[PDB]
């Protein structure tokens, strides 16, 4: 159950990226607590409560994507806080699967590090069109020479992966000092204080420089699957970002990708937050009641879509830029037969290369056009952007191009 969720603005999903420890989370938790001095209806979230998994507590990182709500005189927002840490990269992706806008948070102190290029990448191949910059931690560097140093490596850095690079906002705080002081005072506001005030620039920005998306609520559902869980009562949820369409409790879906056969079901319920819809709308990020299916049937990778809507493929031409050895890519070439993982949206699988007759390999910088035969079944879709990750490093980027089978 919750309270049932009202329409008052439009809804726009954001989310942070950027290198380990560079204070994405911190900066998370104190957007729930300056926004809730202005709204009573932000529920605030501490910095222990968005890093609150046993293993995110022991490893000290952030390991799963969280999705929190604030919301400011303009709009509602999502927020999704994805992981720095290299390990946890294809947390990051399903995560930016999810954002309209991202807010990159770089560290003034160490500035641009290898995730910071990376997340910047990986976002762009997963659909994020808009980037506004914070530069954190800017209580630890007092030569405000380096921050001028910092920032236009920022713009360098984006302008290298065909983002506005020198338009872009780039706000300058700390999130940790404005996170304290909402903590001494709970109300504080507007004009009271420096700190909480950059970060109403940085939701000034947000506003304004990032802008409500053109959403296909006439097409047919479809919601890539981000997670699943049981509410122990309920049932079983899929959590994701409806990327067209809309959902009422009473619909079938099918479960689409990662499988054999399909699955059809029916719609039990459908919540944004803690609170209730009747209904969910193109752009909306939603739990989903799925009946008579256990989370052990649905998994991260799939789609629910309208029944007879898409069709899994295995096999597609595609367009390959694969990355140089100085965008942390691979050192050698690769040949026919190399089998890396495939990214899509939420979904990852392993894919085997197929290079055309009369190409030998393939390497770093290498523009290139290949066959990949998939070894599941995927929702795929021409035109539809991808990354490809293996052991451990993105050596790839590409457009799928006709698909095949
Ligand atoms: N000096 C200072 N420390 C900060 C600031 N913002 C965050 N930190 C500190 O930096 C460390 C990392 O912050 P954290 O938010 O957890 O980083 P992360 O980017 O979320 N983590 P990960 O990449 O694992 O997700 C914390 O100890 C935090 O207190 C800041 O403005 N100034
Ligand atoms: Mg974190």
Same mark, same amino acid.
């Given at each position: 159950?919750?309270?049932?969720?009202?329409?008052?603005? =439009?809804?726009?999903?954001?989310?942070?990226?950027?290198?380990?420890?560079?204070?994405?989370?911190?900066? #998370?938790?104190?957007?729930?607590?300056?926004?809730?001095?202005?709204?009573?209806?932000?529920?605030?979230?501490?910095?222990?409560?968005?890093?609150?998994?046993?293993?995110?507590?022991? @490893?000290?990182?952030?390991?799963?994507?969280?999705?929190?709500?604030?919301?400011?005189?303009?709009?509602?927002?999502?927020?999704?806080?994805?992981?720095?840490?290299?390990?946890?990269?294809?947390?990051? !992706?399903?995560?930016?699967?999810?954002?309209?806008?991202?807010?990159?948070?770089?560290?003034?102190?160490?500035?641009?590090?290898?995730?910071?290029?990376?997340?910047?990448?990986?976002?762009?191949?997963?659909?994020?069109?808009? !980037?506004?910059?914070?530069?954190?931690?800017?209580?630890?560097?007092?030569?405000?020479? +380096?921050?001028?140093?910092?920032?236009?490596?920022?713009?360098?850095?984006?302008?290298?992966?065909?983002?506005?690079?020198?338009?872009?906002?780039? !706000?300058?705080?700390?999130?940790?000092?404005? +996170?304290?002081?909402?903590?001494?005072? =709970?109300?504080?506001?507007?004009?009271?204080?420096?700190?909480?005030?950059?970060?109403?620039?940085?939701?000034?920005?947000?506003?304004?420089?990032?802008?409500?998306?053109?959403?296909?609520?006439?097409? =047919?559902?479809?919601?890539?699957?981000?997670?699943?869980?049981?509410?122990?009562? @309920?049932?079983?949820?899929?959590?994701?970002?409806?990327?067209?369409?809309?959902?009422?409790?009473?619909?079938?879906?099918?479960?689409?990708?990662?499988?054999?056969?399909?699955?059809?079901?029916?719609?039990?319920?459908?919540?944004?937050?803690?609170?209730?819809?009747?209904?969910?709308?193109?752009?909306?990020?939603?739990?989903?009641?799925?009946?008579?299916?256990?989370?052990?049937?649905?998994?991260?990778?799939?789609?629910?879509?309208? =029944?007879?809507?898409?069709?899994?493929?295995?096999?597609?031409?595609?367009?390959?830029?694969?990355?140089?050895?100085?965008?942390?890519?691979?050192? #050698?070439?690769?040949?026919?037969?190399?089998?890396?993982?495939?990214?899509?949206? #939420? #979904?990852?699988?392993?894919?085997?290369?197929?290079?055309?007759?009369?190409?030998?390999?393939?390497?770093?910088?290498?523009?290139?056009?290949?066959?990949?035969?998939?070894?599941?079944?995927?929702?795929?879709?021409?035109?539809?952007?991808?990354?490809?990750?293996?052991?451990?490093?993105?050596?790839?980027?590409?457009?799928?191009?006709?698909?095949?089978?």
């Amino acid at each position: 159950a919750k309270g049932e969720f009202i329409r008052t603005k =439009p809804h726009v999903n954001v989310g942070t990226i950027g290198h380990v420890d560079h204070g994405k989370t911190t900066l #998370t938790a104190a957007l729930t607590f300056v926004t809730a001095a202005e709204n009573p209806n932000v529920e605030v979230k501490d910095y222990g409560d968005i890093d609150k998994a046993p293993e995110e507590r022991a @490893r000290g990182i952030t390991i799963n994507t969280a999705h929190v709500e604030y919301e400011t005189a303009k709009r509602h927002y999502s927020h999704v806080d994805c992981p720095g840490h290299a390990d946890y990269i294809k947390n990051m !992706i399903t995560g930016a699967a999810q954002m309209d806008g991202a807010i990159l948070v770089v560290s003034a102190a160490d500035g641009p590090m290898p995730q910071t290029r990376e997340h910047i990448l990986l976002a762009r191949q997963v659909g994020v069109p808009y !980037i506004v910059v914070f530069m954190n931690k800017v209580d630890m560097v007092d030569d405000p020479e +380096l921050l001028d140093l910092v920032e236009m490596e920022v713009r360098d850095l984006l302008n290298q992966y065909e983002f506005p690079g020198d338009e872009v906002p780039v !706000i300058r705080g700390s999130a940790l000092l404005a +996170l304290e002081e909402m903590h001494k005072n =709970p109300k504080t506001k507007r004009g009271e204080n420096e700190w909480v005030d950059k970060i109403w620039e940085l939701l000034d920005a947000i506003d304004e420089y990032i802008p409500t998306p053109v959403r296909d609520v006439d097409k =047919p559902f479809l919601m890539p699957v981000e997670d699943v869980f049981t509410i122990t009562g @309920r049932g079983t949820v899929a959590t994701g970002r409806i990327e067209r369409g809309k959902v009422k409790v009473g619909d079938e879906v099918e479960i689409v990708g990662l499988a054999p056969e399909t699955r059809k079901t029916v719609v039990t319920g459908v919540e944004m937050h803690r609170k209730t819809l009747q209904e969910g709308i193109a752009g909306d990020n939603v739990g989903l009641l799925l009946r008579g299916v256990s989370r052990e049937e649905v998994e991260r990778g799939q789609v629910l879509a309208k =029944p007879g809507s898409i069709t899994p493929h295995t096999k597609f031409e595609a367009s390959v830029y694969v990355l140089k050895k100085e965008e942390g890519g691979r050192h #050698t070439g690769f040949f026919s037969g190399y089998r890396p993982q495939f990214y899509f949206r #939420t #979904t990852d699988v392993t894919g085997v290369v197929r290079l055309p007759q009369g190409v030998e390999m393939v390497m770093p910088g290498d523009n290139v056009t290949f066959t990949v035969e998939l070894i599941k079944p995927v929702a795929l879709e021409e035109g539809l952007r991808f990354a490809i990750r293996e052991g451990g490093r993105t050596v790839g980027a590409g457009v799928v191009t006709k698909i095949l089978e």
